[PDB]
Amino acid sequence: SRCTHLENRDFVTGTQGTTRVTLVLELGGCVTITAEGKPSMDVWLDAIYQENPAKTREYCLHAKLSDTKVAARCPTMGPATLAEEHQGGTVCKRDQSDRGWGNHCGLFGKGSIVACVKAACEAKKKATGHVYDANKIVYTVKVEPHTGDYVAANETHSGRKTASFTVSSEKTILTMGEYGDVSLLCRVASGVDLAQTVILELDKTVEHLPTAWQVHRDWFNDLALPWKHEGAQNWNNAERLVEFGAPHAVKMDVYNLGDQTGVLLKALAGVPVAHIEGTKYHLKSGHVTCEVGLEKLKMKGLTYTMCDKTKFTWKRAPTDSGHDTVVMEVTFSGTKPCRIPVRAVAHGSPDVNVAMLITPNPTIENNGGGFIEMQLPPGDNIIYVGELSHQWFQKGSSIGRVFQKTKKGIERLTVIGEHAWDFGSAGGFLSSIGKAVHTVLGGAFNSIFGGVGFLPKLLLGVALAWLGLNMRNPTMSMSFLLAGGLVLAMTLGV
Amino acid sequence: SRCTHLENRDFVTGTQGTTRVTLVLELGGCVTITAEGKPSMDVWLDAIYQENPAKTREYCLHAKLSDTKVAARCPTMGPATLAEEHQGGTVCKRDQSDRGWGNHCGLFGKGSIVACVKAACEAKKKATGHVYDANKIVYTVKVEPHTGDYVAANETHSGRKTASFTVSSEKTILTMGEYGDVSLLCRVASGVDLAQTVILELDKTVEHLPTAWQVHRDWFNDLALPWKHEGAQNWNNAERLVEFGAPHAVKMDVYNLGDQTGVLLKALAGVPVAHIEGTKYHLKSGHVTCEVGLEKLKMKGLTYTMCDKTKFTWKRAPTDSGHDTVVMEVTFSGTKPCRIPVRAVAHGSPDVNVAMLITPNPTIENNGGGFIEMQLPPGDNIIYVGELSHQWFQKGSSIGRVFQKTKKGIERLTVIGEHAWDFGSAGGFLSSIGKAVHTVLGGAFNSIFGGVGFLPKLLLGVALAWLGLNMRNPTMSMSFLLAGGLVLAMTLGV
Amino acid sequence: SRCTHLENRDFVTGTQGTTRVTLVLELGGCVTITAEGKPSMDVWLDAIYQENPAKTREYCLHAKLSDTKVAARCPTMGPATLAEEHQGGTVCKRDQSDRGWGNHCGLFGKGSIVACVKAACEAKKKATGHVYDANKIVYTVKVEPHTGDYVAANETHSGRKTASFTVSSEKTILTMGEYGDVSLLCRVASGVDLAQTVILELDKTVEHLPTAWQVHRDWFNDLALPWKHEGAQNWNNAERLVEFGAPHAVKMDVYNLGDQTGVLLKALAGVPVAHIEGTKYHLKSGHVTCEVGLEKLKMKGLTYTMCDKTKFTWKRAPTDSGHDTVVMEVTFSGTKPCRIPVRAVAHGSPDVNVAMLITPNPTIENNGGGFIEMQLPPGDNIIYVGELSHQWFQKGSSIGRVFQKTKKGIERLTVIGEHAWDFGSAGGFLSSIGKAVHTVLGGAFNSIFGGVGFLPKLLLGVALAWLGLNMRNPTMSMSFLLAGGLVLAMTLGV
Amino acid sequence: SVLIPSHAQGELTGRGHKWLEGDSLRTHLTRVEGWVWKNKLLALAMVTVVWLTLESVVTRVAVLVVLLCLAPVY
Amino acid sequence: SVLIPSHAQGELTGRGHKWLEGDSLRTHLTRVEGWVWKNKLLALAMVTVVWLTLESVVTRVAVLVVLLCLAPV
Amino acid sequence: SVLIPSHAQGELTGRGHKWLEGDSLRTHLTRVEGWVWKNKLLALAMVTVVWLTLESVVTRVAVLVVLLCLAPVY
């Protein structure tokens, strides 16, 4: 199946007789959902995108200057003036210069000078920003059944099915041939917080650069650069990129601060990448919450006869997948449609079959089948397929597996936030309480420290720790210690 | 007299029997030399320059990339190898990436991948540094006789003379006609410290940007940018502008950090400007110490007859100068060669003459003119030229003049350091002790706090004052408090 | 019985309540398994080998240098460069040399110099590292019926049978002629850790050196020599063998540090030897845990009648074995097929028979005489074969036998480690507890002191003891001293 | 990443034109002001906690100054 | 002059490709360690001054930590 | 086994070219500093144990010097 390809994968099992299971799909991830007597499914989120989003204020990065003009008058007459000073698209400065008989004034002292220039952004040095509309965003989810066949990453799997969700059409049914029907419910209101994300374009034909960035809205609105809205002809605040030198008697210099691209791209350091492929603007990082209903699923070939035990052969020997699972591929030559008798035996025990199969009831069929994936307990084991056999030392330990999965859980919690509590739960009391406590505490923490640097956050944590330790009474001492500990813990964890 | 065209004018007065005087000549400044019985002189420094200076290593600011190549190998088949990795002009990086049956390999695990790209510098985006040679540098000093003519700043005075000093230059004499010879001896290598100055050229073609900068050598030699010398064909450390994304299974991306011109110009903020003219490289700052010999000067027209008291008229009425002096110009009708009778009296005391002329023995000549410059005491005065009379209120006060001179002395100390103790000095203990104490104290302070910066230096001053407060014993407590206060005061004043 | 040919031998007895037994066979060892109701068997591990294993890395031991180049530049100019600096297979260095008029330099000071040389390796002076593949390794086990005939070490015994275990193999049945069938299950990948060992090949055709060595992977990765992979053309880090002298004005010398084979062979002191045979790579140390099933083995010739007691004669009079047994050979001339009446009696009691026979039931047949190996208690005894008789004195004592077995046990435990608890194991508390505790404590100790030398280990032990004597009041002092003693003892006892 | 450090101020002097106005205490205070408006809630929190907990006026003033100066640069 | 402030680190996250590695604990530990190894003499001078002057273990730890963090300025 | 001892350094001197630089006090101190930087944690462990168990400053200095000098070889 597809989700053996990724570094990131997860497993969830429906408890005895459960009809549906809830998931949070993370873009660039996978979940394998399994239940007794139900065919195993791979479910993942493939794309989040919109066509021609809305625009927002557009910045400039490299100014082009023209028609420099200057005027000045002597040390006792009225201030100088230029017509361009009242027009649009011009930047001007007013200053005083020293003059005297040396340059044809009648008196010695401070005369007046004014300079003006015309400013327009260079051809391809704009920075456009876009925002998504919740009424138009498309989420695409894909589902794949565990047939007994394997296909590479550049090959078309015949069982792949697609469901596209908008704010309308929140629920869909997918039909999967012999395996039956599966139900998907995915409300977009639970997904990415669209109010706070902006897509930043720069120039998309520049090779060796990403096509777009996913910057934060508050950060985007604070940049000190020239800017305008779409269609307008005259830039606001060319002053930020045009600077003036000190004046001579009757002349004054206009300087251009140059292209800012290198400063901008250094500021964007930590921002996630986004993509553009035409009319379509893709996020490459996000998540959705869904409920999957399994009741309409059914097994294939459950009534077949067993294979001829002597006919099997390996096409690929068993190998470790890196997810604590073993993968195998078998070939067969007897009467074609039949059921494979795979099993595995632990050393030092009476031949009990201990394998847990991810692909249930494997079959061989006309021009298909043969792939197997299974989990074995730690230690020395033997694998049997009919008369064919192989050996396997399963590395690791039970406590190691528990720790590994706990670490994965902590990582998910810190990456997805409050929505992590909805992963794989049967709903109810524990999950609801966890989510409520998490959200109410996180809101306050985000309110007090949103946008602050990691170093100042750590520094305040240390200060609070010291001050609580030094506090004059126990209650306040503990309160300050707890506050410092909380800020330190969260800053170090994130 | 050119000295009237600028602020920063300095008056130096000798005494009868003074053979010669020492001056520190600065760009954008000038001195008028007055003597008890000899014509006044104008002396100033016009240019410090070299022709075709020697180069130093060039830096790139906008990388051009081409012909990316990528290769990879499976988790057990050893590291990847690519032909271009050993050539020149190429940037390469090798890393590990995940593999598995999803890709066309035998095992699941970390493989090897390597990527390379040809790097160059774009057509006109290279900063280049030049350094001066002490045996070729040229200083130009100019001297003007201070005749009674007046000439605008865009027009050439027929009497001024030029001295082009080099390391191979002796004491030189300038004739300047009837006024007699004047002598100059300028000590090259007494001025700008050429061992730590670099002229930075960015692109002399662009319109709205200064043509050169005078950066510090200790700052120029450490700079995170690709660099090479003039004759080399391939760049070193091109890896400073290219970046590489996290690898996929069989691909990884090459990124370009763009043009750095805007961050460079931001760093150069405080640097002084320089200039380029064809083959000539000019500084626009610096100073040189030079001795001027007045020995062979003579006054003109000493044997001429006195002009008629009548037959004068004004051409420009008396007006206030920028330097607390009065300037005027008169016309005469009659037999031309003669001496102007000029005097001034306090209102209500015609017996005493209070004028101090900057132009001794004013004359009118067959084709000359009647420019005059005077200093008068504060208050109400009358100016007489023959029988022409004019009233004049002289603003200011004696305390104000003393204050102005003291302030300018402080500024010269701030600008040229210990060399200030040589300005206009006849020698002796004041100059000797001042220069010795200044050089030693300044050397120590520069050794400790040379490159630390204003606000960090001020903060350390505050810390030192706090330490002096904290130290328990009163006497060194106070001494250290005084030390902290002194460092604070000096770092704030400079 | 091949067990007689070797210095090292071990006996294991199956009590009648058992039919399968656990062995850990050691390459170069040998074991006799016997049960009162079954014919005895000789089983040993013959070889561990692979064909054409993988190549990890290759080092070079004698650099070849060619086409030296050098260039220099004067102080006032940019550093020198050579094209060889940007090519494959070259090593280069740049430095500063003093120059002046004496070298046509034009100015006194430090210039620049650069030198380069092409580097390769001599035809036969490479060193190749090979690694095994767990899915291709072969273990050979051999079993011998203990026929009662005898043959020397350079002769082939008709009853000897072979088994070639691999990961593919499972429990195998060997048929042994009239004696029946025996079952073997060997657990490949439970023996030597293939992830830690590298087979190091220096050269095949040197007449007076071993063909291969076995070395540890952590050591082999840090050999600090020039290194490469098969098929790659240019060496990495030839700078480790080329060395550069200090420069003259315009010359620099390149030195070669020569052959390293001597220092390598001196560093390898203490590692096990390996072997190479055509395409096969053999280890010469290692072990395999196996379970051997004795059911369906049956006696030979129980139906025969007893021999003519008067006809026997000696062919090889009784002799003392190396393993505390007696060995003899008889000849007979009567009706050939018949059982040998062999017995022995202690001198103090003429009624009780005392012999214990390793041969299960000796008989003579049309071909093959009578070899007998038997055990007797310490003291004076008489051996009878029918009328033929001989007199024997058995050295040692029961206490000595117990002590010698204890020595054997300790030695095996020290050599093989954890697997010692499986030798002759049939489950049970003592065996299980021993293996568990040994695993835990041995792993803990190894993680701390793995790879550390004996002298540092002894010094740490002594220092810990001394610091315990020097330690503060609380009782934990004794534990500190005990820790030092423990590390010292565990270092000394091995 | 390319990291060009800002040129030192006091080592070079003259009377010709300078490229731009250098960094200064007024600039520092202006930047602090710009930061405070965006982070007012945390500003009030930091001022109130120290003003309440510490005992001496001068010490509180010093700590406030140090905190404000340190806040924006990172 | 125009100042484009650096983007906040933890406000926005996920599992896609990031642009470049932003300032983090690892980076700052590396910076302080390298700086100390660059300014050894000064580092030991400050450390010993504080350790000698300040009276209590916890306050010495706090002051040393803060100073080492701020040292690169 | 053949074991050629390292030539003594202090017994010969001159101003001509030497074959290859040998050991010296500064070289050993360089190796000590490099080792300490490589194994920071172990260095602090060794320092703290003795700082806690030995009361006399001179004794601590002596033991620390001995341990540091022996560290690179072991």
Numbering used by the authors:
A (entry chain B), B (entry chain A), C (entry chain C): 1 to 494
D (entry chain E), F (entry chain D): 1 to 74
E (entry chain F): 1 to 73
Task: Give the article text.
Here, we present the structure of a low-passage, European TBEV subtype (Kuutsalo-14) solved with cryo-EM and single-particle reconstruction to a resolution of 3.3 Å. The merged K3 datasets gave a final reconstruction with a resolution of 3.3 Å. The asymmetric unit contains three E–M heterodimers. Superimposition of the three E–M heterodimers within the asymmetric unit, based on the E protein ectodomains, indicated conformational differences between the M proteins located on the two-fold (chain D), three-fold (chain E), and five-fold (chain F) symmetry axes. The major conformational differences between the three M proteins arise due to the different locations of Asp23 and Ser24 that diverge by up to 2.8 Å at the Cα. Chains D and F twist towards each other and interact at the heterotetramer interfaces within the raft. One π-stacking interaction between Trp37 on each M protein, and two salt bridges between Lys40 and Glu33 stabilise the M protein interface. For each E–M dimer within the asymmetric unit, the reconstruction contained two densities not accounted for by the protein model. As phosphatidylcholine (PC) is the most common lipid species found in flavivirus virions, we built PC headgroups and the first four carbon atoms of each fatty acid tail. We built two N-acetylglucosamines (GlcNac) with core fucosylation (Fuc) at the first GlcNac into the density, which is consistent with the TBEV glycome and with previous flavivirus structures.
